[PDB]
Amino acid sequence: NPIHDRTSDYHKYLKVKQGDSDLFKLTVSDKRYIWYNPDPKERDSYECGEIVSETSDSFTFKTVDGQDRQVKKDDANQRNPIKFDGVEDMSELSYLNEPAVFHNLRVRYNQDLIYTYSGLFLVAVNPFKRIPIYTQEMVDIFKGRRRNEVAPHIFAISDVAYRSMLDDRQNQSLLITGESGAGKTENTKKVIQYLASVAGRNQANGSGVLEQQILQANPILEAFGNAKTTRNNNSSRFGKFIEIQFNSAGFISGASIQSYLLEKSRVVFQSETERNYHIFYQLLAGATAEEKKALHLAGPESFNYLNQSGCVDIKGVSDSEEFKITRQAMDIVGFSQEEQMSIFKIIAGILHLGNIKFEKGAGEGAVLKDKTALNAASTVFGVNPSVLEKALMEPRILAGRDLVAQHLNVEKSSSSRDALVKALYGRLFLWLVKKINNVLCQERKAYFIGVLDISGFEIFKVNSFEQLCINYTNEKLQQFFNHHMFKLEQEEYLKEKINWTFIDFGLDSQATIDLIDGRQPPGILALLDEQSVFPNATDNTLITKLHSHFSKKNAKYEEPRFSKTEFGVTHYAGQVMYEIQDWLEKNKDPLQQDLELCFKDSSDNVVTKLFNDPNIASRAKKGANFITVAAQYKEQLASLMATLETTNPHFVRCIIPNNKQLPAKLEDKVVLDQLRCNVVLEGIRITRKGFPNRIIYADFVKRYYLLAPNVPRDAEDSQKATDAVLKHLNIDPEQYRFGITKIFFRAGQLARIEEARE
Numbered sequence: 001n002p003i004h005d006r007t008s009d010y011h012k013y014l015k016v017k018q019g020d021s022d023l024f025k026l027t028v029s030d031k032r033y034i035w036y037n038p039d040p041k042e043r044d045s046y047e048c049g050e051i052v053s054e055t056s057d058s059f060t061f062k063t064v065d066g067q068d069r070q071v072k073k074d075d076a077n078q079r080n081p082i083k084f085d086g087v088e089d090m091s092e093l094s095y096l097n098e099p100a101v102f103h104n105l106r107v108r109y110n111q112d113l114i115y116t117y118s119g120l121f122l123v124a125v126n127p128f129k130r131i132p133i134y135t136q137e138m139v140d141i142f143k144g145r146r147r148n149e150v151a152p153h154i155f156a157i158s159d160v161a162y163r164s165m166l167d168d169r170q171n172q173s174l175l176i177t178g179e180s181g182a183g184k185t186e187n188t189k190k191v192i193q194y195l196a197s198v199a200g201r202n203q204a205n206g207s208g209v210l211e212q213q214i215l216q217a218n219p220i221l222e223a224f225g226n227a228k229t230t231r232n233n234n235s236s237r238f239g240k241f242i243e244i245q246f247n248s249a250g251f252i253s254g255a256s257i258q259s260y261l262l263e264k265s266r267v268v269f270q271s272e273t274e275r276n277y278h279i280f281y282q283l284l285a286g287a288t289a290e291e292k293k294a295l296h297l298a299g300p301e302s303f304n305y306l307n308q309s310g311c312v313d314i315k316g317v318s319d320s321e322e323f324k325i326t327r328q329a330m331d332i333v334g335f336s337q338e339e340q341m342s343i344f345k346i347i348a349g350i351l352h353l354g355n356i357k358f359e360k361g362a363g364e365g366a367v368l369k370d371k372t373a374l375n376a377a378s379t380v381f382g383v384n385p386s387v388l389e390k391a392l393m394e395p396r397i398l399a400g401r402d403l404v405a406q407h408l409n410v411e412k413s414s415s416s417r418d419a420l421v422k423a424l425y426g427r428l429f430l431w432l433v434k435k436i437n438n439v440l441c442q443e444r445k446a447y448f449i450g451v452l453d454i455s456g457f458e459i460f461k462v463n464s465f466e467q468l469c470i471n472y473t474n475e476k477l478q479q480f481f482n483h484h485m486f487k488l489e490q491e492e493y494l495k496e497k498i499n500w501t502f503i504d505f506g507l508d509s510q511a512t513i514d515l516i517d518g519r520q521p522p523g524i525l526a527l528l529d530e531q532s533v534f535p536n537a538t539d540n541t542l543i544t545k546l547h548s549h550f551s552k553k554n555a556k557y558e559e560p561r562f563s564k565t566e567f568g569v570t571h572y573a574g575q576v577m578y579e580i581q582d583w584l585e586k587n588k589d590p591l592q593q594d595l596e597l598c599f600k601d602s603s604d605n606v607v608t609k610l611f612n613d614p615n616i617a618s619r620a621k622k623g624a625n626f627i628t629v630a631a632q633y634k635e636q637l638a639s640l641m642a643t644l645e646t647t648n649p650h651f652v653r654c655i656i657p658n659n660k661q662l663p664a665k666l667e668d669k670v671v672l673d674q675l676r677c678n679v680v681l682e683g684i685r686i687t688r689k690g691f692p693n694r695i696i697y698a699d700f701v702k703r704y705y706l707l708a709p710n711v712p713r714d715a716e717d718s719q720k721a722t723d724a725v726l727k728h729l730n731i732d733p734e735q736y737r738f739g740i741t742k743i744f745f746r747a748g749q750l751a752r753i754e755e756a757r758e
Contacts, residue, residue, distance in 0.1 A: 003141050010141055013112050014133050015151040016086045024706075028757035029081035034061050035099035036077065045668050046099040048079055079103075081755075088152055089117030092693045094747065096685055102672050109657075109666060115152040118680050119694070120485065122157055125655035125671070126183040128663030134190060143198045148696065157650050158191040161449060162198065164648065166250060173647040174451040175477075178654025179674055180458070181231035187652060188242065188453050189218070195244070195449065199252040210440075214244075214255055216329040217436050223326040224279045224429050225259070227266060232661065233316060236453060237277070238262040239470070241640065243450030245442045254442030259433055260636070261469065264422040267305070268354065274309045277425070278322070281306075281314060283347050286323030291341075295348050295380050305354030305421075333436050342606050345380045346428055352377030353421050358393060358413045366410035367393065382603035391594035392416055416592075423591055424610070431609070431616045450647070456677060459576055465583045468524070471571060472516050473637050478572050478679060479507050480644060481651060485687075496739030500690065509572060512556045516569075517634055522549065525630045532587045532628055539580050543567065573677055587628050653678050692747035706758065719743075729753075 001008045011017040019026065032051045037043065053060030053070070060070035077097035084093060085107045093100065105123070108116050112131055116123045132138075133153070142155045144163065150156055157174070165172045174191060178184045196214065200207045227237045238259055245254035270276060284292070284300035292298070301307050330340050355373040358366045368374070371389070378388045393413045397406045408416070457474055458467050486505060493499040507513075516523045527545055531537045546567065550557040556570040566579030600611040611617045619627055627635075655674060657666045675681060688694070700721055701714045715721030726749075727733045735749030 009132070009135060009137050010151075013131050014138065014153075016088070016111065016113065024757075027083050029083050030756055033079045034059075034071070034076050035079050035097065036061075036063075036071070038063075038065065044672055046077065086111060086113065089119060091117075091119045091684065091688070094693065096681065098672060098675065098681065101681055102668055102675060105671070105675075106666060115154065115156075117152055118683060119688075120651065121678075121680055121683060122152065122154075122650075122652045123655060123680060124154065124187065124652060125657050125666075126181075128657070128661055139194060139197060142194075154187050154190050154652070155194050157652065158194045159198070161191075161648075161650055162195055165447060165449070168648075169447075171447055171647040172449045173644055173649040174449065174652065175454075175644075175649055176452060176652040176654065177454045177456060177474075177477075179456045179656045179677070180235055181656035181659070182456075182654025183232075184453060184652075184654040185222075185226065185234070185236040187654065188451050191449075191451055192218075192242070192244070196252060199246060199250055201251055211252055213333045214440055217255075217257075217333050217440065219326045219329040220333075220432070220436065221257075222278075223282075223329075224277050224425075224432070225262070227263075227277045228275050230273055231656075231659070234278075237266065239454050241450050241452050243448060245445040245448045248446045254445055254448075255437075255440035256442060257433060257437055257440075259430070261466070261633075262426065262429070264426040267350070267422055267425050268418050269308075271309045273311045275312050275314075276306060278319065279326075279347060280351075281312065282319045282323040282326065283344065285314075285320055286327075287344070291344065295345065296376050297348060297351065303351050303355065305351050334439070335435075339606065342604060343428065343432070345604070346424065346607065349377050349381045350421055350424060353417050356417065358410050360410055364409050365393075365407050366413045381599065381607050383598060387598045391592055391598045392420075395592040395594040416595075419589070420591060420595060423589070424607075427610050427616065428606075431606075431613070434616065448647075450643070452644075456674070457571065457573055457576070461577060462579075463576065464579055464581060465586045467576070468516070468578055469633050471576065472513070472633075475509055475513055475572055476637060476641060479509055479513075480641065480649070481679065481683075483507065484649060485683075496737065496742045496744070498737075498739070512569065512571060515550070515554055515556050525634065528583060528587055528630050529628050532584060532630075537584055539582070539584050542584060543580055572679075587630055588626075589629065653680060689748070690746060691744040694744075698743060 003010070005011075006017050006020070033048050034051055035046045036049055037046045047064065049062045049064065051059070051061040055070070055073075058070050059073045059076055060068070062068060077099050078095035079100060080094050084104065087093065087104060090096070090101060090104055093104065105116065105125070109125060112127065112129070114124050114127050114131075134155075138153075138155060142150060142153065142159050145159070147156060147160060161172050161174055164170075174188075176184045176187050193215070196207070196211050200211055202208060221240075222234070225236075225238050225240075226234050229235045239261055240257055240259035242255070242257040244252065244256070247253050266276060275281070281300060284297050287297075297303075300312070306312055327340075331337055352373045356368050356371070356377070358368050361367045368389075374389055375385060378385055393408050394405045395408065395416070396403055398404075454473065454477075455470055457471055460467070482505070489500070489502075514521075514523065517525050519526070524546070527542070527549065531542060531545075543565070547559050551559045558568045558570065558575070560566065560568065565581070566577060568575050568577040570576075596611050596617070599607060600617075602608050609616070619632055622631075655671055657671060659670065698719045700711075701718055705711070705713045711722045711725065713721075726735055730752040731749060735746040736743050
């Protein structure tokens with residue numbers, strides 16, 4: 001069934017399926033109605049009442065329940081001629097506030113249509129349901145086709161990103177970012193595929209190795225990288241730019257993925273209904289009774305690095321076999337049949353490491369009573385016992401010009417193997433990516449398409465040092481948009497002639513950023529660094545200094561009234577509240593060189609290659625030694641942004657619909673909560689007052705021609721044929737400036753013409 005019309009794979013759960021009847025009876029608009037919030041107590045969940053008033057100073061209307069209270073034309077959220085229901089790019093709206101769009105966004109959803117537009121902004125709200133909208137024909141309907149000629153889709157920004165490059169020959173970016181719970185993992189999970197097939201190399205159906213050797217390189221990532229939390233069954237657990245290259249003709253060539261921040265904590269600790277990195281269960285749950293004692297696990301329940309928080313009982317999908325997939329994916333993108341055993345040789349020495357119970361030493365001196373965990377735990381990494389344990393409880397500190405063997409009590413031996421138990425996962429993994437990257441990795445690399453998988457503003461009263469870094473990058477981003485989409489009105493003003501009494505809008509947030517990473521005048525990250533320099537620092541000081549530098553001195557910083565262990569910043573979207581605690585330690589990630597020394601050698605080319613390579617056990621030795629997680633997280637985002645700033649971008653946003661994994665309900669308590677969370681609506685409502693239902697430009701020929709006698713169809717050209725109409729009828733010229741070449745009906749000056757049906 002040819003792609004044209006209605007009745008197939010596409011129109012059904014993809015395209016709003018237009019009707020088999022042709023004329024303007026699909027609907028007809030008159031009168032008006034306003035959105036509103038029945039209860040003056042709740043700022044969510046509005047309603048719909050008919051206007052009866054048109055006050056000059058005020059505005060008034062009807063209601064369902066009795067009340068008939070009034071509302072300033074300015075605080076009123078209007079409702080559109082219900083002729084726009086599932087309108088594909090929302091700019092086409094006439095009136096826009098919120099309710100007016102959690103509405104257009106729901107109908108777009110009632111019909112199971114996750115994808116939508118905001119001019120430049122694709123909104124995509126995760127369904128949780130299974131909706132075939134990806135199959136191989138969803139592809140051949142897109143390839144080589146224009147955003148106009150097809151309903152919205154990930155496959156509809158994912159090609160554009162490709163074609164523009166081919167022709168508007170320039171490196172290209174895709175930026176996907178959403179509240180973690182948003183499925184932004186699958187979105188990316190498709191751009192790669194889609195591209196991979198159109199620039200997919202075979203005759204008409206196939207792809208020879210490379211293009212595939214790639215597809216299986218996420219299973220690795222998802223296997224360790226992704227993990228399952230209250231918010232999902234499989235949470236993108238980490239940030240990364242997976243990013244890919246081609247040769248000039250058009251055929252895909254390379255890939256290079258760089259990752260960063262991970263909940264390295266998800267190893268030692270997880271909570272209610274939570275589990276671990278899946279590598280961990282399929283590990284035990286999947287190894288033939290053979291290798292299971294080849295290293296000795298027996299019970300996964302038997303383990304406490306896994307048998308703590310409730311649900312390890314592994315909901316829905318089967319994993320026993322998912323193993324044959326990941327393990328089937330590593331030595332397919334080529335992973336040795338011998339060494340990739342070590343991965344395992346490792347994932348378990350970790351496990352035995354979360355099983356030892358250093359018990360208060362008689363008097364003091366904390367010590368383990370008996371030992372087989374550790375004996376075993378050492379017997380895969382291959383590291384002598386009177387060594388491993390000794391650096392652990394008895395680590396050699398250096399007081400001045402002499403250095404000795406302190407004996408830890410529990411209070412601290414307790415958290416050592418805790419902190420060393422991430423140093424490996426955090427580590428193995430980083431290098432583990434280091435591998436496959438460096439063969440999908442490319443050389444001259446003519447062009448590239450990088451795609452960005454980053455998070456939204458993680459805002460919670462429990463946010464700490466981490467919450468900042470990700471939120472520092474986010475701010476860093478919404479200028480890239482605001483500034484980029486700024487230079488938009490740049491060309492815009494070379495073809496509508498003379499330009500707007502203008503904003504010259506610059507960073508309204510160079511400010512906030514400057515407060516974080518400001519050199520001089522310094523910022524949070526400066527003092528963080530500045531003090532991380534020695535011990536007699538008691539985060540107590542850390543905050544005391546801050547309120548001195550900042551408090552009553554920076555528009556974005558606020559000092560709490562009664563609370564003292566914490567403060568608050570005023571980010572792009574409202575305030576954030578960071579508490580301090582171990583920021584001073586979390587800033588280093590310390591670990592005794594009594595231990596490296598114990599693991600910097602072994603039997604094993606990798607746990608040697610882990611604490612033996614300078615780009616895996618270290619960071620560039622600057623200012624005499626290691627630079628801090630704060631300084632670095634600066635060195636690398638900027639580099640990232642640097643790159644971004646030289647490529648064309650396309651932003652995609654992932655809206656989480658509800659908090660219990662429920663496909664079906666779609667609660668305004670959340671969606672809305674974030675709609676504002678992104679500059680999606682306010683992205684224009686503020687920005688494009690000036691040109692309304694930005695058409696395919698100035699095309700007054702047979703598209704809309706029912707006006708009685710005077711405004712015809714094709715006079716001489718696609719521009720003029722009736723102009724002396726608003727200068728005349730309705731009101732004046734103002735609505736439309738008159739650029740020599742282009743012009744725009746400012747719809748916003750309509751109240752004398754276009755509301756009835758004929």
